[PDB]
Symmetry: C2
Subunit: 1011 residues, 2 copies
């Protein structure tokens, strides 16, 4: 029999799902969550062998381990050890589509563990083994005797070893298969790997047990009285002296308690359950749970006797909150939620898909510090410690079933087939049976990207039947199906519509206004941050804040899924799909996160932080309206620090303590602000600072900020008459301008500034030319490769029009001396295959004071695709350690993503000016720049600059950041106009028309001097 090739068999001799059990024998040890000695961890050094097929495994492995097998640590994935190549694929299945049959070449991992069991465990009670996760299917042997079979990969599999274990030395043998019929339900967009990637534990229970318990909370309209209903299910012999005690604790203080004997209410004509008992505990003025204030209680269920002798104890964490939907609005504790969620994949920086507590805690801290209040367990149930840490730290959790058949054509082939109805149920129901006691979990999810079938509807309303306390959602079928209470499309745009046949993604504002539609909209996936991305996030959050039924969404996604490889010298470097020999692969589409693999923040994280602030600011006159977006907490750990700056020079500042009610308004009256008579723009900047240290933040954390323009003083002063005039000399090929120390040289053949001299030091390695092309971004490329070309992609439209190939032709290059200046007029045109795309007309005025003023007028054809860039390009010959600039910063910003950057004077190291994206592209641009100082050079005007050690040509050719080599000098790109980056999705043109260079005529002025 081949159980891995049959969807009707998903388990053999596997125990029922339940909430996590520690099997305490002391109620005080359960209350404080002390470790239980009845639970043993089998994590550690296991013996491992690899085989190309399960049939190649010798049967002598069932008796003793092979001498040729290696020692590995469990949990791990054997693709991170050299036994296989991890396979990255987005939509296409990594195997031949032929359900439910897998290829004969099925990689097999044979794990073995030799251990000992105490004799007290064997005399009484039941001993079970728990596998928290095995990818994908596995067969279990205990002492050479077959125990059972498991198929699911993200839910624990539990087997009874009481009749298998022996005193002394015991050997457990697990045969794990890479591919199974369940892998057809596991088409998630991640790295496909395999192995025992989660914890292995051994649990000992008494003869009579606490088999299950369900804890629910019911409230009134005011949330001042609460009823905790705890229903307890036992296994074993029914005895009249058995009693249960349900105790609720806040810290060390008992709040409520209840003791009843076994026996339930009459339900049917035959009676009720004799092995179940329900307890109703009344709580007066409970402390409600939320993402703002995570108030937690400890619920201890003690199965004992009438004498008071404790048999067993099970403890859990209970949060008094109630999540429901009324009037098309999702309410938690009676208040409409605004979801600031993010999609999270379980990707360890070093160990692949093996998750520990440290990475969970770090990820939670960076999400909470960046104003994220929710998280999506995508696309599978997570590690049960993740949920507990979410309850402790206060994050909303959307628990999603491990179902995805994105590679099926059509996508609902398996979900409409009743033959796959059992197996899918085993991936849904058990999940609920594991996670219905966590208050962090507020929304159940059927899965992702599986079309719409009747199995989805059946499992959906099954969850509605068993657990009415949580709303449940599903994307497939167009996000309007009967299988969702919450509208959750992926990558739907704010204003424009994209009507695909029979699954149209209408705009969210239009979607809410459709005839007969009532449900709230929370985006399951939006704002694809794949590389240099996340443009239009301000539009998304403006729509969220303006519309009551637009309640936020989940950003895709948190962390890049890149794997560490090593070069010839052993230096580590991040790698993506296709770097391990896996073919076919979706090349860099595994990196969509807001942080790097080592949890280094991207510049997009600052924009996400600014757009998700819980404090909104409105400057009117000289007063500030501060509006809270907290729903349950008072502003008790926040103060407003304001400052006024004249062109980056501070003038006045102050600190005001914030006292704002939840979703309330506060007025702050600033003192008499300075009124300078010096030229420049006055900027008012406010920041919200937390003085005390929270469990997730440190003392002085900035949670919100805002900037406005105050009164402006335009400069009307005139420069003094420079005593020296520039000498202009005309050669047969060059124009040479002297000002004593400073010498400019223009080449009359190319028409560009050939060379600059200060003393005898050359300053330009390449001439100052025009640039209308950038290194293509991940949003620009989309899903277009060399083999398959997408004509809608921006990079393909640019290279089809010859933007990367067009050659500059010199139309005019004249020079003439003025009274106190030398005037250089140039005029070029860029042509490709006889078609003129761009025409540049520049005027260089060299004054006697030393400044060189460049006026640039660019004509752009309307029929050619809109250029990504209009500016200048040169390579300086000097590498300076510091870069100074008066402008927006200090992070990377773009025309469609700049609301987070503040206008000030920023000084940064040169290496900080380059964003180390794994896939090289355009990066490091700083918008709104009024002044730029680098070495001896100073540039003034209004421009967007990026300064780096890598040319745009090198950034275009190179596919990995570790292959980049620093070039001689420093590459500078000053641009009059720059095009937005997009970010609605990464397979369609996402740049809005307001951020496209579509005017046709552009003008910009620069001043180049030596400070």
């Amino acid at each position: 029999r081949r159980d891995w090739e049959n969807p009707g068999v998903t388990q053999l001799n596997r125990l029922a799902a339940h909430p996590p059990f520690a099997s305490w024998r002391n109620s005080e040890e359960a209350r404080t969550d002390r470790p239980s000695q009845q639970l043993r961890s089998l994590n550690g050094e296991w013996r491992f062998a690899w085989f190309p097929a399960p049939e190649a495994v010798p049967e002598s492995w069932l008796e003793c381990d092979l001498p040729e097998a290696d020692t590995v640590v469990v949990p791990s994935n054997w693709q991170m050890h050299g036994y296989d190549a991890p396979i990255y694929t987005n939509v296409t299945y990594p195997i031949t589509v032929n359900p439910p049959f897998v290829p004969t070449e099925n990689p097999t991992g044979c794990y073995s563990l030799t251990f000992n069991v105490d004799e007290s465990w064997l005399q009484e009670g039941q001993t079970r083994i728990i596998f928290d996760g095995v990818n994908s299917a596995f067969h279990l042997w205990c002492n050479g005797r077959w125990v059972g079979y498991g198929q699911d990969s993200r839910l624990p599999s539990e087997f009874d070893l009481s009749a298998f274990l022996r005193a002394g030395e015991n050997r457990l043998a697990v045969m794990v298969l890479r591919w199974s019929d369940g892998s057809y339900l596991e088409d998630q967009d991640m790295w496909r790997m395999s192995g025992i990637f989660r914890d292995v534990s051994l649990l000992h229970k008494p003869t009579t047990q606490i088999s299950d318990f369900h804890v629910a909370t019911r409230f009134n309209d005011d949330f001042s009285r609460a009823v905790l209903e705890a229903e307890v299910q036992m296994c074993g012999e029914l005895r009249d002296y058995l009693r249960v005690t349900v105790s609720l604790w806040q810290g060390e203080t008992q709040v409520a308690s209840g003791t009843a004997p076994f026996g339930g209410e009459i339900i049917d004509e035959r009676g009720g359950y004799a092995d179940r008992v329900t307890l109703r505990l009344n709580v007066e003025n409970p402390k409600l749970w939320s993402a703002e204030i995570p108030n937690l209680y400890r619920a201890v269920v003690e199965l004992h006797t009438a004498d008071g002798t404790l048999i067993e104890a099970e403890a859990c964490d209970v949060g008094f909150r109630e999540v429901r939907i009324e009037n098309g609005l999702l309410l938690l504790n009676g208040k409409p939620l605004l979801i600031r969620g993010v999609n999270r994949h379980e990707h360890h920086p070093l160990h692949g898909q093996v998750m520990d507590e440290q990475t969970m805690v770090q990820d939670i801290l960076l999400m909470k510090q960046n104003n994220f209040n929710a998280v999506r367990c995508s696309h599978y149930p997570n590690h049960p410690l993740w949920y507990t840490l979410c309850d402790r730290y206060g994050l909303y959790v959307v628990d999603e079933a491990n179902i995805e058949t994105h590679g099926m054509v059509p996508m609902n082939r398996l979900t409409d087939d009743p033959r796959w109805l059992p197996a899918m149920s085993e991936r849904v129901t058990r999940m609920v049976q594991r996670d219905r006691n966590h208050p962090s979990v507020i929304i159940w999810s059927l899965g992702n990207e599986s079309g719409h079938g009747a199995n989805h509807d059946a499992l959906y309303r099954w969850i509605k039947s068993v657990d009415p306390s949580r709303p449940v959602q599903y994307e497939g079928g167009g996000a309007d199906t009967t299988a969702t209470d919450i509208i959750c499309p992926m990558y739907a745009r704010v204003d424009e519509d994209q009507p695909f046949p029979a699954v149209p993604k209408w705009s969210i504002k239009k979607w809410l206004s459709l005839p007969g539609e009532t449900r709230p909209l929370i985006l399951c996936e939006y704002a694809h941050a794949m590389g240099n991305s996340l443009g239009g996030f301000a539009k998304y959050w403006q729509a969220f804040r303006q519309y009551p039924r637009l309640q936020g969404g989940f950003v895709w996604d948190w962390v890049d899924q890149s794997l560490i490889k090593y070069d010839e010298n052993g230096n580590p470097w991040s790698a993506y799909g296709g770097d391990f020999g896996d073919t076919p692969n979706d090349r860099q589409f595994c990196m969509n996160g807001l942080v790097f693999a080592d949890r280094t923040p991207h510049p997009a994280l600052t924009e996400a932080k600014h757009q998700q602030q819980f404090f909104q600011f409105r400057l009117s006159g000289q007063t500030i309206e501060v509006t809270s977006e907290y729903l349950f907490r008072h502003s008790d750990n926040e103060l407003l620090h304001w400052m006024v700056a004249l062109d980056g020079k501070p003038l006045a500042s102050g600190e005001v303590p914030l006292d704002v009610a939840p979703q309330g308004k506060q007025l702050i009256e600033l003192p008499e602000l300075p009124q300078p008579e010096s030229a420049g723009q006055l900027w008012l900047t406010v920041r919200v600072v937390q003085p005390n240290a929270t469990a997730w933040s440190e003392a002085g954390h900035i949670s919100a900020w805002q900037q406005w323009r105050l009164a402006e003083n335009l400069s009307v002063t005139l420069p003094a008459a420079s005593h020296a005039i520039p000498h202009l000399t005309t050669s047969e090929m060059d124009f040479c301008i002297e000002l004593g120390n400073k010498r400019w040289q223009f080449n009359r053949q190319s028409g560009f500034l050939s060379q600059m001299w200060i003393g005898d030091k050359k300053q330009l390695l390449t001439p100052l030319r025009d640039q209308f092309t950038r290194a293509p971004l991940d949003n620009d490329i989309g899903v277009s490769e060399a083999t398959r070309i997408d004509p809608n992609a921006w990079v393909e439209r640019w290279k089809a029009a010859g933007h990367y190939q067009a050659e500059a032709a010199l139309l005019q290059c004249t020079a003439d001396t003025l009274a106190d200046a030398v005037l250089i007029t140039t005029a070029h045109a860029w042509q490709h295959q006889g078609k003129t795309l761009f025409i540049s007309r520049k005027t260089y005025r060299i004054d006697g004071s030393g400044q060189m003023a460049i006026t640039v007028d660019v004509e752009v054809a309307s029929d050619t695709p809109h250029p990504a860039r209009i500016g200048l390009n040169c390579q300086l010959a000097q590498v300076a350690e510091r870069v100074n600039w008066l402008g927006l910063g200090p992070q990377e910003n773009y025309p469609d993503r700049l609301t987070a950057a503040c206008f000030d004077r920023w000084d940064l190291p040169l290496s900080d000016m380059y964003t180390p994206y794994v896939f090289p592209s355009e990066n490091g641009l700083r918008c709104g720049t009024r002044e730029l100082n680098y070495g001896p050079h100073q540039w003034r005007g209004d421009f967007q600059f990026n300064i780096s050690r890598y040319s745009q040509q090198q950034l275009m050719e190179t596919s990995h950041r570790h292959l980049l080599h620093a070039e001689e000098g420093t590459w500078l790109n000053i641009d009059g106009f720059h095009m937005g980056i997009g970010g609605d999705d990464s397979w369609s043109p996402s740049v809005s028309a307001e951020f496209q260079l579509s005017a046709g005529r552009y003008h910009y002025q620069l001043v180049w001097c030596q400070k």
Copy 2:
């Protein structure tokens, strides 16, 4: 205000600033290049303060001494259009009588603007570039003072207003500011070029 002769042109550089009660609102910097072929090229750079209200207009103003019967223009038309109301006008070559260039609103105001104009011919004069022009017999000062269209009197010559940038007119209501932010002159720095010649 400086002037200097070039190899084959005469270059005139001017720079002004508009001030009210010691506060500078606008700064205009113009360059007049007079070529030997006859064309006069005007480049205008305007700096606008951010704290002052956004101006309704950024352009040039003059009064010609000649009243011609016909006005020709290559641009959007042939009707009156504005930056926020121009989707109906088509781009073509339109020839219209001068009296047709004035919209006879009962309450006098700004009227007769033609957007997207690439060429404008009036009498012997030709203007080229990208601009929004309105040509009439009534000054803007007269249109501001006068409250009824029948009290308007034709002035000597012809008043011409060529504007690099123009602000939208609104129309959502008539008791609140209805002009959208995309049609407001709020950038701060503006640039436009004109060519004045005799056809």
